[PDB]
Amino acid sequence: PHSHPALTPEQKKELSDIAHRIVAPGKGILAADESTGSIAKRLQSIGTENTEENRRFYRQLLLTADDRVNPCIGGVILFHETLYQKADDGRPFPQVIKSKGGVVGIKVDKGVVPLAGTNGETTTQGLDGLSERCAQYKKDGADFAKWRCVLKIGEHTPSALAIMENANVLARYASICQQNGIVPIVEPEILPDGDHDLKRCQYVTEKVLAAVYKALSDHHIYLEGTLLMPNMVTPGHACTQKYSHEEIAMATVTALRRTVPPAVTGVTFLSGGQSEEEASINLNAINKCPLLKPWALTFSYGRALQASALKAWGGKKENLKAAQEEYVKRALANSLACQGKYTPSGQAGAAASESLFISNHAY
Amino acid sequence: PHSHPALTPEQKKELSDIAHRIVAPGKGILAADESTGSIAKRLQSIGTENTEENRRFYRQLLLTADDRVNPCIGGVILFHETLYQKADDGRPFPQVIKSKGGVVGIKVDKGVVPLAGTNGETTTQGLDGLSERCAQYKKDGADFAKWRCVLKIGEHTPSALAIMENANVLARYASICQQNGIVPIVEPEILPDGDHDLKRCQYVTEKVLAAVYKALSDHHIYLEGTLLMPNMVTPGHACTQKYSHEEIAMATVTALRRTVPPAVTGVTFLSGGQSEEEASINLNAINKCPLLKPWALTFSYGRALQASALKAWGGKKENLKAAQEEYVKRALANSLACQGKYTPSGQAGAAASESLFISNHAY
Amino acid sequence: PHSHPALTPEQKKELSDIAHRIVAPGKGILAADESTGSIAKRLQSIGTENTEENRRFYRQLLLTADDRVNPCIGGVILFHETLYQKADDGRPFPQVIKSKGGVVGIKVDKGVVPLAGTNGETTTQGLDGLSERCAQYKKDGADFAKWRCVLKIGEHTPSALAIMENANVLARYASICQQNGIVPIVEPEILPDGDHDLKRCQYVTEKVLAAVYKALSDHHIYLEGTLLMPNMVTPGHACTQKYSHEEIAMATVTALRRTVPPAVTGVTFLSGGQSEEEASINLNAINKCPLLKPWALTFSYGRALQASALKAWGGKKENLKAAQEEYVKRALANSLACQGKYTPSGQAGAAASESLFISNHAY
Amino acid sequence: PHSHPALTPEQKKELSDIAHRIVAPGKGILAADESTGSIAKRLQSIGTENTEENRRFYRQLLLTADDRVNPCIGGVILFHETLYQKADDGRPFPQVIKSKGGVVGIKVDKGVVPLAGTNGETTTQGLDGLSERCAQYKKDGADFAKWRCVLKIGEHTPSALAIMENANVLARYASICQQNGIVPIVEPEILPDGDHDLKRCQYVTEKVLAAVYKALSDHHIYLEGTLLMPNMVTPGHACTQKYSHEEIAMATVTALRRTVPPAVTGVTFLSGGQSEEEASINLNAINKCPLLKPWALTFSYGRALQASALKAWGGKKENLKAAQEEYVKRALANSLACQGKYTPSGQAGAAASESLFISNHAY
């Protein structure tokens, strides 16, 4: 019942300012923080050898795209390796990002581990020495971080244990980040795997996010200096029932309104298994949803910003600009989407929508 | 991990519609739900015998005030006795309230009880047979309810037990209400008693409200079909440090933004120990606070609507109009305040731009 | 982190002394606390009208059995009505019980109520005015109380909510009892309904009991002044797999060893749907289990003490001694069983072998 | 509500067997797991350079003490460095320990870290890669582990956060250990620092241990395959009120009886700031306490086994035998103490047919 402030007013201002820069109007996040193991599958899909130089070149391709991406990209999440790589002109990648108006982010979790006594559920590791890592990352140009927890919808999952433990470890990570001037992006990802329907995803998302914010409260987290990186509320990948984008938008915004305090500066959706176009259309629908939304609703996209660029590249240096063009097209699309101004087939305000239509009490 | 819906879409729509009517723009709540024991000391202060007829006459005085109060009063909380009393013309008081555009409320708790093993802390009783009581009250014209929990700021309070238990019983009460078509007002009152400062009240309010909304989540409460009735965030009564109304406002709105999901339809402040004018000025400042506020911010006032009326009445029938005039004046003032339009002058403002120097990172 | 003792050393001694008397070696509890609704249909089973007089006569039959029962019966749980009834000789039933060396107990819960948003789960009501009720019951000769919570094993049950809420209300009930010199018997009954196996029941019993004792800790309950009244660990009623009494004993004792602190004075098993003979044999096996058991392991039997007596009586005054004889046979058997000294031989009636199981039909 | 067994029966039997060997009658644990940083001040106290060789020689001195220690020492906790060192004759230290009948243990935490927003409270780190470390340690001869959490009694401490978080991380550590055939010793140390009295230590110890065992339950920990390493319940170092060894014993055993399930195989007390003789006398009083104690109550002593030996050694190879003799004397003393047969003076005793005491409800 007694306060022992975790942060000074100055520390709070720093975190809040960073958080707001990342999700400024029209801006979102490029999630480029795939580990060597994670990106292996991406490079194999284009017959490209998973070498440090090819990883460097691919990240260079994204980070040095032309200035059209600048008002689209408020932040870039990097993997450790990339944080210490340089572009062809000798500039460290953090400097490249900053010169284009982006905030530099660093993924700091050390992956998932199995929870014994559960049906294949996990928590996430990475807290050991995290404070010192954050202090160093801060010095080396990073101002925010990312940590991924993974939950699965199944017959008996997510379990009480999995929800409580993942919420708790997210809070520890967030606490340590804020002590070191790093804005934590809290990523409690509920996988879309399975044949569950939209209502079930909405229910599980509501319960998971309630647990997350109670844990953040218990650990004295300054919400204004955080971002949330959740799944959209969608049917399961194998669900037999089909839904519209407006229904997905309504389920998502309702789940967030029921759980995320207004003090949270922004929500930066992960794209999950969604295609590039699907992720953009859904984000647009979310931003056109006629409910009050007291936080930025924008993107933290990996595959949904990268899929076409990677394919266009094909591992060939001669395809640089063609690949970059595909990335710029998705950056532009999603920048419009996070303002509710994205039209898929067109561009000239040729997308009129629905009002006075549909109950929000079915959600 | 599996939903077993507490409410149908139709039940949800009913609750949401009621909650929104209560806190519609310009409207707040008259809290007239004092028990015989509670109002006794109020009648003694004006030398009036605490009889059923004098209580009836007093409640009639408030409820039958002229039509100027109609746009000011969205709801009226009654004590059980009053719910079944009639005006002089034979009209049930609920009908009187409804004819003036008000929603009828009923207090359903059975008072506080001591928590053993604590330093004088309490929980609140009243769950037994509550469902049947709610069904009866609904039939007899009530559409919302009130339940008061009380917490104290002290050397060791509020304790973990007190916070958890009061949050839990509020959730049970809210669950039972919603099963019977009654909108629950959740009232976790943190008393202003003591010499603690503004920061301490804000800290405790934040921890209490986080506990409250986690419990409501655990018990499957439909937030859109609820209201919150909290203390404003103020220094303790015996605090020597002085604060402006803008500081009280910032602390209050900050605490709510950090804990209350946007889905909550409205916040209806209790006036506590504040004077009539103090309570209007603070509510107005709260509504002028330049942060995003995704819920109605209005009043649920007892003393702050009734004090001058009670005094002007003095127990004398000939002072009816004078007493009513005092009540009407406070209803008008607070109707303005809950829109941020209260000026100490007779409805005359437009001096709305002269705010500059206060950090929200100091809160 | 600061103690505010709920109880004085004198209060602790009184409660500890009472608890130990109830479960003194060789002794158990007659659970005769069936409400009018509960006792009604068994009275129907022998064509007897459910009148106050017939209920009184039946209770007299049990309570005034000959002195062979005295060393078997440490306590008797009464329903409110019976607490204020008198034997034919004018003696209040509490006086009758005490004169035979028994402690008088009173059931104080007010039945189960549905938890909204669950699959047919309940919590239990009865806290309102419980303190005053306990003080009065204490004056009128009761020294312990009973409160029944009910949980069910199913695909999604018991849920996190049901476990937490039932554990919490048990703790509130225990707290209030101990403030008034009443030893609370904590009864978290996990129903045997369903086709689950022994392992599943053991798992659920362990999770439920861990929740119960954490809640009792949080609410500052003095464990030495309590008793526990749980289900034995058994397969579900409809389980096809067969188990020995030694396996039932091992699962039961293991579940308790993993969850019940040694400070708990005694465990008084409910018989659930077991026959008179099965309940005795299992209790015997439990006491013979070769693991360390730092609490009394005895009976709190209703039907399993009463079935043969009720049938032998048949509602006929002339069959008094015959009926009493059946009850005495069962008290003696279970007195031996709670010492691990019961061997059946020559020979219990067919009434003592028939399943006493009725499905829990809120359905 | 559904079991997904963390362990097979075979895995359980292995863990239980190990746990029981460590705390077999008359046996305790030598805690020799000081890090380089931790042992530094003790080597300085005898003017000895903190080098790997001097550390090796000192550990060798302890581990190769003569065979009188064999029936006294059921286990030895090593620091990582020491697990991979060899005696002069080339035998790995794990082989030395095992040949004398001891189980080899390994400390696996990575020290305390500050909890932001608290008054100087900590949690403990070390989960990252812990599974792989445990598998490696198992292969390299360790069968149990130790993990130290630290809590402090102060005006506002231990806080709800600190208790919750330390209990949770202890449970994670325990889970990972048991997946790898390693018995976890759970060490929630409440420091003796401060001027608090015996009752306060007892209260905090009860609350901490209740939290620890709820967390172990939530994480599916197999208690029979664990040990507990708690503080004894004592007044704070600066407390002016004086207590007898019998009062310390009663408070300690009462606290454990109220919180530690019988299934826990043993309690191995840390000696904290107690002197060699004090720690032995208190352990003896604990084992003579006339309450039922369903777990082994023995020692896990660092300083209380090493102080005189370290002093006699003085960093001088020439003092090997003298130093070993001091260690052997404390090993003998504590073996008697954990059997309740230690007399604090020289040679003459054994006339005890003791223990069934007057006081009990003052605690």
Curated annotation (Swiss-Prot), chains A, B, C, D:
Beta-D-fructose 1,6-bisphosphate binds at R42, S271, G272, G273, S300, R303. It holds the Pfam family Glycolytic. It catalyses: beta-D-fructose 1,6-bisphosphate = D-glyceraldehyde 3-phosphate + dihydroxyacetone phosphate. Homotetramer. Interacts with SNX9 and WAS. Interacts with FBP2; the interaction blocks FBP2 inhibition by physiological concentrations of AMP and reduces inhibition by Ca(2+). There is a cross-link at K41 (Glycyl lysine isopeptide (Lys-Gly) (interchain with G-Cter in SUMO2)). It comes from Oryctolagus cuniculus (Rabbit). It is an enzyme of class 4 (lyase). It is found in: Cytoplasm, Myofibril, Sarcomere, I band; Cytoplasm, Myofibril, Sarcomere, M line. In vertebrates, three forms of this ubiquitous glycolytic enzyme are found, aldolase A in muscle, aldolase B in liver and aldolase C in brain. Alkylation of Arg-42 inactivates the enzyme. The modification N6-(2-hydroxyisobutyryl)lysine is found at K98, K146. The record marks K146, H361 as: Alkylation inactivates the enzyme. Gene3D superfamilies: Aldolase class I (3.20.20.70). The gene is ALDOA. This is Fructose-bisphosphate aldolase A.
